[PDB]
Amino acid sequence: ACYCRIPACIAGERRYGTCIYQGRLWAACC
């Protein structure tokens, strides 16, 4: 599954895109 994260993905995840909520930009991390 993919998670929304700030400021970076966590261990063993890779960034594939972006989430938008609460007026902020999140890394989509899978």
Instruction: In whole angstroms, give the CA distance from residue 23 to residue 10.
Output: 22
State the structure-solving technique.
X-ray
Name residue, tokens 């970076």: 8
Tokens of residue 7, six digits = 């400021």
Q: How far apart are CA 4 and CA 21, in angstroms?
A: 9
Cβ atoms of 26 and 6 within 8 Å: the answer is yes
Q: Encoding tokens for residue 11?
A: 């261990």
* Residue 25 to residue 27: CA distance in whole angstroms: 7
Name residue, tokens 């972006």.
Answer: 18
First vs last Cα of the chain: how many Å apart?
A: 6
Local structure of residue 1 (DSSP, 8 states): -
- 28 within 8 A of 19, measured Cβ to Cβ: yes
Q: What does 2-30 look like in DSSP terms, one character per residue?
A: -EEESSS--TT--EEEEEEETTEEEEEE-
* Contact yes or no for 22/8 (Cβ under 8 A): no
**Pairwise CA distance, residues 6 & 24, whole Å:** 9
